[PDB]
Amino acid sequence: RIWKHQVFPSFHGADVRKTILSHILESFRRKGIDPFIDNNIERSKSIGHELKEAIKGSKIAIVLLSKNYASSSWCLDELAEIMKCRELLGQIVMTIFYEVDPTDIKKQTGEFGKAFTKTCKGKTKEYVERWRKALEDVATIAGYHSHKWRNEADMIEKIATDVSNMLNSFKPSRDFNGLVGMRAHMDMLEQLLRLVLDEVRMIGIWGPPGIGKTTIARFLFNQVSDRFQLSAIMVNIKGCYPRPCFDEYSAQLQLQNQMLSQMINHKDIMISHLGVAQERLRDKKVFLVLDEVDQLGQLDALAKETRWFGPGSRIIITTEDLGVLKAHGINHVYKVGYPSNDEAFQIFCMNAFGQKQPHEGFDEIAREVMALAGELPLGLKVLGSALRGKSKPEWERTLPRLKTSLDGKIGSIIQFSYDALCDEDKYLFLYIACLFNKESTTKVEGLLGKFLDVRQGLHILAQKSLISIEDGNIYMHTLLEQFGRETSRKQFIHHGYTKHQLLVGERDICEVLNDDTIDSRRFIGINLDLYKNVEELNISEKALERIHDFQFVRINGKNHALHERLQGLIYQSPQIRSLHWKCYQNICLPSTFNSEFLVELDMSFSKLQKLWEGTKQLRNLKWMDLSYSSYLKELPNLSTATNLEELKLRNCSSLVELPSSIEKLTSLQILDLHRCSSLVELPSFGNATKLEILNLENCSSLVKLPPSINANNLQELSLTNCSRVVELPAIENATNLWKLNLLNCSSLIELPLSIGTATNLKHLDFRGCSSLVKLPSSIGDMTNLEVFYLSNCSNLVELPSSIGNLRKLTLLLMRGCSKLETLPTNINLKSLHTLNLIDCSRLKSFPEISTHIKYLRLIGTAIKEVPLSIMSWSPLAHFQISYFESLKEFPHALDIITELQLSKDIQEVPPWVKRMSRLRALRLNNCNNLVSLPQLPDSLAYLYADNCKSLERLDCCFNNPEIRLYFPKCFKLNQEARDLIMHTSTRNFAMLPGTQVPACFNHRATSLKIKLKESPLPTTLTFKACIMLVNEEMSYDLKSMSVDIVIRDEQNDLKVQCTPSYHQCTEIYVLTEHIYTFELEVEEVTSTELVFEFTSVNESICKIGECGILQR
Amino acid sequence: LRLVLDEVRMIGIWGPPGIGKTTIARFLFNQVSDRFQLSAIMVNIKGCYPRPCFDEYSAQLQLQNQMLSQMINHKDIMISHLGVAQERLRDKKVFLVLDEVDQLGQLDALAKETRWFGPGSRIIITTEDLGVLKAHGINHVYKVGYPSNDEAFQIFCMNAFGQKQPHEGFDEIAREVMALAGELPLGLKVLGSALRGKSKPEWERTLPRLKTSLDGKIGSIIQFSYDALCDEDKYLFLYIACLFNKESTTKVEGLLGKFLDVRQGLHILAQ
Amino acid sequence: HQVFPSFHGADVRKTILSHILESFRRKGIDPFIDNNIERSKSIGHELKEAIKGSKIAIVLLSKNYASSSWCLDELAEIMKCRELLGQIVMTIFYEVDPTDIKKQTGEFGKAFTKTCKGKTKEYVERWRKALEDVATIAGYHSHKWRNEADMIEKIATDVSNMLNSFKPSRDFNGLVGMRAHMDMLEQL
Amino acid sequence: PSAVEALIETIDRHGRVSLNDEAKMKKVVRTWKKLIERDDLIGEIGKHYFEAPGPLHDTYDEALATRLVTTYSDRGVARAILHTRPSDPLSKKAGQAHRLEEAVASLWKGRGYTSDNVVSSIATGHDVDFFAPTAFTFLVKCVESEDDANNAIFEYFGSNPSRYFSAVLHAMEKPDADSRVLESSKKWMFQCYAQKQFPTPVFERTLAAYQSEDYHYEKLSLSQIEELVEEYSRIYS
Ligand SMILES: Nc1ncnc2c1ncn2[C@@H]1O[C@H](COP(=O)(O)OP(=O)(O)OP(=O)(O)O)[C@@H](O)[C@H]1O
Ligand SMILES: Nc1ncnc2c1ncn2[C@@H]1O[C@H](COP(=O)(O)OP(=O)(O)OP(=O)(O)O)[C@@H](O)[C@H]1O
């Protein structure tokens, strides 16, 4: 329906127009209510008719009742009209009994009754009847009583609240419904807030422009401001403040004037001195929000000290520069973060399609546009709004427009923050956006050091949240970089008295080189990306004549094409500061290439062979990165390369040898040869070299090595495969060896004794290091050595007695050490956890180091004995012995053993095994000649039998726990034994040799669907399930399988639960013709219809074939 | 329009700059607003908007504030949040006229959902690009057409010969000047005012320079509409105005296809 | 405190005073609070201490204001502080003529006379002098104002304006060397 | 809680709840990134899960890898390894990622997966993805020989030379494609047909028979077909 007014008040003018009605109206104006005011009736109009019209167009009528309400005929007539309107139309009527009682109203007696009698003396009958009926029916309405409230202000507040609520005014904002995922922000920000600490704590919010600081502040204000006596929000303080700021004090005074006028309800204050806020807000709980504070003057004007505000007050200042917060001493800072990819897509979809999910067919293009928008909420909103009502072809053909040009709405907002920078900061920003987007901070400092103060510039930029340094690499947001690239054409760069510009473009910025009409000296940087076509780019022959001073070059020439013109244009530069060329696609660097000035050289993919063919002046060179240049054979003389820092010959498999001129590389710290299948030697380095990271991972032909390294600072040293390496370079100190490994470095003979000097090598491997004869005696020297792997280190017939000095190693894996024969005896390792001696085919003595071992694994050994000292050892969570005959002689060993492993050929069926208490597992490796099995002990969890020729009867009644009975290949099983295997109440798998599901499982089928019925009213049900596998090219020994289970109904769609909703085993054999059984519980009480679905996770490994289950 | 259906139908009005979108809106508001309980007209929203608009929410809030102050005649109060317009106007007949709307932000400011106005109301927004109307999903669009040649002559003689709908005296050069003015009421008015009060020989000296260069009055408005384009769109505009004024779209695509993405450019220019 | 309110509870504590309290609360004004359980026949020392440090007082006058020796003593102390200290006194004539307050007449005068029986001469003299002085000072006549809420809002605005001007330039005295400039400029 | 405590709780929750396939396919990546965030976790959490009850392991890395495979499917772990390879090979994160992927490869070898099983696990549905280095190198580690890796990927294409050559040519067009390795695979295919001593036109028709519609990938075009014929022509006459 339609109403002109929300509330129409009815009252007697002589009584309440002055005193109480005024207050009610004032309260209504303060709650966003527009009541009808009779004083505003237009002049020269009939008051009665206009008032009657205004009555019928009112949603609510409020009737104020006074002792002289009956005195005026206007009051009675408007009341009668009000009541006819309510009973006919349906307008809502509320009553206020101000110093009057409803009882005397309907009697028309005494108070107000005298007035009614006086006013009804001259009238007709129908008027009196209508007035009386209306008076009675309005006295019936339950409203508010004046005498029931102790103070008039509370009653008026309650009346206004009731009217506003029953108006369904919807005071909470619906705007805060289209925003995505601010629960994370609010939860993170509540912890910084802690509004129960009654301090005056100050809180900051900073982040790149457009993440949503303003929206976060608005939402937080809406949620929280109601809990403080005084609240105020100031938006875009940066915008209003004068830019030059010629008179700081006047601006500060005006700013504090605005803050006071909006905090205190004083509509128009004129502040004389900046101390008014301190004077006025000393003892009050105040919530103040300041948005986009640009500099410290605003903060001093608005909130200089916490003493300005009373206890429990909070102020929240949002900015982009952290330095402003730090200078004011905030230390309570919430750094806003980008939303999740899902949330970003939701925001983009809200702005584009109007819902949280895209329309059909838009998914791929929508995600492309999103990825173009980076992650900024501002960018997502802008792009989504730009593409709202379009159609899919329009999306597809406007995406290239979006890529090439940055939208104006993003551009201006970024421009505003870009303008506040210093000149050198602007130049550094342009440099980062154009060339060094993702580069080491050290490399940027080296390259741009002489032009400008790079360190302080980077620090300031990070403070401004224009860049981010993650792990020594600087990162600029995609939109921000895109803005930076555009301004490169429109802005110049001044370093001293000269002037320069940059050239950044995919391929379209090359015709400017063919302009031939402008000075090309002002071009110190090129960023080209040639992943478009193998066609040669077009340059005028005259442009080839001009020589260009190009200092920074970054070419990603990703194609098989060769660019003769580009090479001639660039390598004619006199001084080239840094040169990156990906996919060079040539043979040699041209001879006319001057290299005296060359700090950094990078060729990440190349076809170079014997570059420079001659000695050159590599005076100030600090980085060589030749990577993946697989077609490379030699390398120039590196004499006079004394300043070289790092050399990465990464994965260049054809490099036959390394030059002896590496001796001249005094400052070299990094040598990288991760894959060099064609090396032979590695020449001596020198004396002051001090290599830091020597990485020779798979040098499968490297034979010789240097005799010494002078490795005073050698963080890492890696020789993983290096199959043919005889000796090893000595070491001086290695006081920082954070990593050393020789995994599979066979053909070694010894180890340099100085390996003991590494006092911090916590971890150490020699896994696979065959032919190693003897560990050095200095092994005991290393401290903090925690882990020590050895595996199949055959021909290691010793172990040094100094090991007892190690005092910290937790595990000593020594697997397959098939010639280890002794072991140091008089040793107590105070913190030793495990000891793996498996298949040590000549170990021949018990390992006697009186320790706190918790995991002892002696399988395949030749021990045949157990000492009596073991009872000193308090715990053994595991202890595994390959069974031999004369274990009967060591009863002390029986109560402590945990596993056991019968050998290939054992006739006997060991009964005394029933005596040992803790026997968690029992393994029969092959047992090609066995018949039965005794009563096993009561504590079993595992039992295996891989390929035995007979286990006819399994006479064990065993009921411990989840027990796994695996029987890979044993077909001579009694049907009673077979049934036992199936009909045992476990909580784990059970696998047996069978060719088809046994008939015991009635309910059969062949992701598959099992359908079955039930016979029960209401109970928890228990099921036994049986499964075979799909006949496939499964490996002879697949050793892991996991099964997921889903159960549903066909009358309802309720997904019923299933407590063992998965069965997983990392040791079960996976084979074709076998039966796998397990157990399930269902508890929901759907009655007749259950549908099962067993799936095998890792479908690429194992697929469930036939199946069938059974109740119990 | 169809007011009798008491819906919240929104209606667009679009055409090249200088046809009378503003004048048509004013005439309609003058004729019909009396039938509506509360009504307001907003003029040149595009010009009265912050060009950089660093805080699009503050500008959006103040735009809604201007609308409410003009509409309720409510002594330019300050507004708390952006949903107030719904709270006030969702239960009253409304006639709203929004003139020269440039981008979707203003529409979100002033009229985002038909549920803001209630049982019968009309919102009429005049724009120049169809894309803004289409994004907001209006589909009730009047493409304003050029007036008839006789009406063009009446307008020109109204603005040239001083209220005389026909000519005075000669009636020869007037039609040459008109044919020069095309059909835009803006062009007719500017040319008529340029020659107002002249004599026939003065008219004759003025004719050539008028023919070889257009007045700055028309040029300023056309330039403003031209500057709101992408660079590719500007290049395509120049190509059409220079060489391919009246050619098949297919041939234009075939000849200019290597440069400008002709299909998208034509789509935008037509919009 | 911020403001010291003086009133007669039986007349105004329920109807108008609550509105003024609410307006002051919403304008960030914290008046001194008191309870009917916190009053004796006399005023007490702590009440005078609160009066002296209030630095602004509001005397709301009603018909039966003079019918409480408590209120009369409060008014006398308020005027004493106004004359000696720089206390600023604001008056509200709630439907009572200032002339009636001045000459102690009308119903107000009758209540004052009925209250004055038994007191010593100096009490009556101080009460009369304070009443005359408070009638002289320029305040807010409730009868003149057509709109009570507007009058209360105006009173709150004036209180706020005459409350953020006490401390003159207390801040930013940390500017250095201004005495030299002042002396060198005094000669000019 | 500390990072370790939270990460253990999260891994246990994910292994406990048995949630959606794609939900696992997503959460595995977040867990993987949280692993390599700092250098001293893989060892520490491996030590923690080593001492927990369960099957025994030869190393901490094996314990962590086994838990990751139990918590997220072989499909999820392979996808995370492929999608979380850092840039700088010498950084800490690269070392952590190498530890994780080597542990997973050793875990798969210990279970005796075939070459085909590994290929199917890595499989993403886009036949060029197998030739991206971040996947090809992991495959080579899992199978220990490039010849076997090429044979496995060739058989995963149903022994279709056309599909294989289409994939390798599409891999030739990658910004970071190792030319040497892709050329090695191509040369392997050439040598496999040289062992057949197929005539050059017979070789052409052997390739172009699959160019028919016998089998959803992108087929070759006659131009590079003739190019490959010419390439094979003289090298092994
Ligand atoms: N035609 C008029 N023009 C101007 N003032 C008028 C007119 N009629 C009445 N008044 C003023 O209205 C006052 C009387 O108001 P009254 O107390 O009757 O209002 P009311 O009947 O209570 O209003 P309502 O019935 O709307 O509550 C008179 O003092 C007079 O000055
Ligand atoms: N202290 C006061 N505060 C507010 N209003 C006052 C005060 N004293 C007197 N008034 C108002 O002044 C009115 C009487 O004015 P009066 O006719 O005496 O002016 P006047 O003395 O003639 O002025 P003048 O002396 O300037 O000619 C009273 O109705 C009263 O409301």
Ligand SMILES: Nc1ncnc2c1ncn2[C@@H]1O[C@H](COP(=O)(O)OP(=O)(O)O)[C@@H](O)[C@H]1O
């Ligand atoms: N969580 C969010 N959900 C939806 N929109 C958001 C969210 N955060 C920001 N936006 C949108 O991004 C735009 C820019 O955010 P804004 O708060 O102006 O950034 P800034 O912090 O730079 O002021 C806003 O118009 C806002 O609508």
Ligand SMILES: Nc1ncnc2c1ncn2[C@@H]1O[C@H](COP(=O)(O)OP(=O)(O)O)[C@@H](O)[C@H]1O
């Ligand atoms: N039907 C008409 N009759 C007379 N004059 C007109 C007519 N239509 C437009 N005009 C005049 O032509 C000019 C064109 O302006 P207009 O087109 O309304 O601006 P906009 O292009 O913003 O709509 C106006 O000054 C108007 O006076």
